[PDB]
């Protein structure tokens with residue numbers, strides 16, 4: 011199948027991490043091309059649904075989306091073969107104080123993610139778990155959005171701190187719950203990877219959000235940048251912007267700043 015990679019074409023070279031979803035390895039495809047090999051933990055996913063969705067996933071392609079190259083499903087664990095992102099998870103990258111980021115770099119990180127999300131929104135595709143922990147950074151410092159849609163197939167920890175009131179109260183998912191999570195991700199970037207609502211538990215965060223209270227301005231965000239992330243948190247989902255509008259707003263601030 012066109013979504014199917016021959017696992018014999020892989021050379022495993024380095025372990026990149028282990029986690030709830032499984033083990034990830036760096037390797038080469040046909041001796042030459044860098045890949046990530048994501049090995050799905052046995053029993054962790056609805057595998058027939060995941061495999062059918064991978065066929066749809068094959069047609070999603072954008073420079074700021076982690077590229078899916080194929081799956082290996084004729085054995086277990088199944089493998090997801092993806093773009094290799096040398097600098098790892100965005101959350102860990104932000105927390106690495108040596109980079110001494112300028113705010114121009116932080117705004118570019120936001121734009122990278124917003125372009126990916128604008129593309130997913132043009133395809134009516136929801137990420138459903140957008141957060142810095144689900145973005146990756148390549149060897150050039152480019153941020154890309156990873157594992158978009160994956161939570162649908164996970165059989166098991168919910169992202170309370172990235173969820174709007176209507177998700178927490180009613181499980182109402184929409185383009186506007188991705189918009190809300192994007193604003194939280196902007197806050198994560200400008201806070202150099204702090205936990206949102208760091209002094210609260212999830213249960214306390216949910217109550218805070220419902221009472222109408224919000225995250226507030228990171229020290230490194232200008233007034234114009236804060237306006238953008240705060241616009242993502244309107245109580246009323248329909249008053250939140252689209253990713254097209256957020257991209258335009260981010261580009262405008264890049265020009266001003």
Ligand SMILES: CN(CCNC(=O)CNc1ccccc1)c1ncnc2[nH]ccc12
Pocket residue numbers: 026027029031032033034046048049050051076090092093094095096097098099146156157
């Ligand atoms: C460290 N790391 C991220 C590892 N975490 C995940 O991929 C989590 N998802 C997942 C895991 C197992 C099975 C199914 C899904 C990477 N480092 C460099 N390039 C990369 N490309 C892609 C990932 C990736």
